[PDB]
């Protein structure tokens, strides 16, 4: 068994990928699994230990690149949209990706915002009129 | 001046009660929310 890791399972023909976190919803003795609106599998009872495990989708989202231009500088920053990226680079297999992407895909400067996470840009304590709108009240600039 | 001030204060006071006691006063925005939710729900339902 694996917890807090993205994995595709098979429970008596119930196929799907997700995270098998602990849950608290109470089932009924005759009920096998659970569903929510739009008919998507939500919770599945453990066949052996008789425990209910919630199922959540594996992480996914878009990628955006913040650049001040080409004539100004070649420095860019990467924003991963609506994903908690404080954990992505270690658990996943990044062997296929070249180290050229790895250098700019990690570092000591990782900023977690409400629109996702920002890699390659430092957080300052001074507020100015903003140039590039990131989202949720956060902007970026070349300083 | 005093009469006008009192009338304005009374109207401002009654505005809150008028807004809170009517269940359909703010229906111009819930309509938008419900329409967007219904559209998104219909799109996903087509996957089956």
């Amino acid at each position: 068994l694996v917890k807090n890791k993205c994995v595709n399972f098979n429970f008596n023909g119930l196929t799907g990928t997700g995270v098998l976190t602990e849950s608290n919803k109470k089932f009924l003795p005759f009920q096998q699994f659970g569903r929510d609106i739009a008919d998507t599998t939500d919770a599945v009872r453990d066949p052996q230990t008789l425990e209910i495990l919630d199922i959540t989708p594996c992480s996914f989202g878009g990628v955006s690149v913040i650049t001040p231009g080409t004539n100004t500088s070649n420095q860019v920053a990467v924003l991963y949209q609506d994903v908690n990226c404080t954990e992505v680079p270690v658990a996943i297999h990044a062997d296929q990706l070249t180290p050229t992407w790895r250098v700019y895909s990690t570092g000591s400067n990782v900023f977690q915002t409400r629109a996702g996470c920002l890699i390659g840009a430092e957080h300052v304590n001074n507020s100015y009129e903003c140039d590039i709108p990131i989202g949720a009240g956060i902007c970026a600039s070349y300083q | 001046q005093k009469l006008i001030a009192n009338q304005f204060n009374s109207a401002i006071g009654k505005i809150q009660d008028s807004l809170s006691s009517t269940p359909s006063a703010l229906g111009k925005l819930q309509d938008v929310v419900n329409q967007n939710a219904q559209a998104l729900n219909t799109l996903v339902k087509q996957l089956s």
């Binding site: 989708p57 878009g62 949209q81 | -």
Partner: peptide, 25 residues
């Protein structure tokens, strides 16, 4: 704000947060 009240994310459908948070408005 109390009178009007409003989630899921599946099948490659995402919702982007607004630029102006409600505090700014």
């Amino acid at each position: 704000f109390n009178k009007v009240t409003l989630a899921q994310k599946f099948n490659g459908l995402t919702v982007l947060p607004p630029l102006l948070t409600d505090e700014m408005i």
